Every structure is written in structure tokens, then in C-alpha cells.
């Protein structure tokens, strides 16, 4: 019908800048930190709630 509205929402969206953050980790040390975060000093916590990226 009409090609006039195209790129509408991507152009209408307020361009928020990417905030800076530190370097992540790579390789053996990244696998090390995600092994620690899951199998040693995992928090003894609420039952069955281990649903990480749990936003409430």
C-alpha cells in the first residue's frame, strides 16, 4: 500500500549511548569464573530459585 513509513521505529527510538564497562575475560579464566559461580561457593539459598538473570 505505502512504502512511506519504513525505518520508523528505529529512527524514532531515543538513541541511548552504550555505557562503558570493563573488559570481560576470555578462555580458560572465563570458564574458571563461571565454574566458580555455579559449583563452588554457590550460595546455599532459596530452594529451586536458581534461575540466574532472575529479575525479581
Amino acid at each position: 500500500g505505502s512504502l512511506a513509513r519504513a525505518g520508523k521505529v528505529r529512527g524514532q527510538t531515543p538513541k541511548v549511548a552504550k555505557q562503558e564497562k570493563k573488559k570481560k575475560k576470555t578462555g580458560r579464566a572465563k570458564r574458571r569464573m563461571q565454574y566458580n559461580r555455579r559449583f563452588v561457593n554457590v550460595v546455599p539459598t532459596f530452594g529451586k530459585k536458581k534461575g540466574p538473570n532472575a529479575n525479581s
Binding site: 530452594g47 529451586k48 530459585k49 536458581k50 534461575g51
Partner: peptide, 29 residues
Amino acid sequence: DPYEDFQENWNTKHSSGVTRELMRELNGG
């Protein structure tokens, strides 16, 4: 509450999410 969420929303759009949250609550993890 995953039980109440499941019993309320099992027919709606959010049915698979509340099913997954109920199964997470039930089968440990």
C-alpha cells in the same frame, strides 16, 4: 508464587514461561 502463576496463566500468552518456572520450582536446580 509459581503454583498460583501457573494456575492463573496456563491458558494465556505467558503459559510456557509459567510452565518453565513451575518445573524449575518442582525439579530442584
